[PDB]
Amino acid sequence: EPEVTAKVYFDVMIDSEPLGRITIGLFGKDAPLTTENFRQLCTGEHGFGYKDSIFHRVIPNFMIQGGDFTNFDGTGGKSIYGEKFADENLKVKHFVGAASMANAGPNTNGSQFFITTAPTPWLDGRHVVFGKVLDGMDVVLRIEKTKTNSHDRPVKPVKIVASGEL
């Protein structure tokens, strides 16, 4: 896989229960614009970001999705560059533990992302893979088993209580 050039983390909690820390390595050389956006949303440098946001969608044996810190339902989010930015590299395929940008078509990247927990070939070529879980995969797997409902949303908020650069 591509070279890791920076590391960010998420501290996750599910209603009083601390799950642990997820460490994500970013592919800075293969996706500078995408990684910088993710990085700065983690630190909250611009006044907004991932701290105190949730993983609004969970689909077992597929992925977990978060990043909508404006509407908390999958319809919001925003990049540091503005509303949306272009797809940087679509040639990197997904793999277990990949961090990838969610979107609503070509060049509509904002702040939403997902972490895959299984092969997802049907996403290859259409979503920019910008990093991977270097540590805390067990935490990702734990989140994946959380009870959901119609719409695949956790019954109890899966909250990112802290985020930043390591």
UniProtKB/TrEMBL annotation:
Domain PPIase cyclophilin-type stretches: 9-165
UniProt cross-references to InterPro entries, sorted A to Z: Cyclophilin-like_dom_sf, Cyclophilin-type_PPIase, Cyclophilin-type_PPIase_CS, Cyclophilin-type_PPIase_dom
GO-annotated molecular function: cyclosporin A binding; peptidyl-prolyl cis-trans isomerase activity
Catalytic activity, as annotated: [protein]-peptidylproline (omega=180) = [protein]-peptidylproline (omega=0)
GO annotation terms (biological process): protein folding
Claim: Signal is one of the keywords in the record: yes
Keyword Repressor: no
Pfam families listed in its UniProt record: Pro_isomerase
Gene Ontology CC terms: cytoplasm
Keywords: Isomerase, Rotamase, Signal
Enzyme class: isomerase
E.C. no: 5.2.1.8
Entry's family note: Belongs to the cyclophilin-type PPIase family.
Function: PPIases accelerate the folding of proteins. It catalyzes the cis-trans isomerization of proline imidic peptide bonds in oligopeptides.
Official protein name in the record: Peptidyl-prolyl cis-trans isomerase
Species per Swiss-Prot/TrEMBL record: Leishmania donovani
Encoding gene, per UniProt annotation: CYP
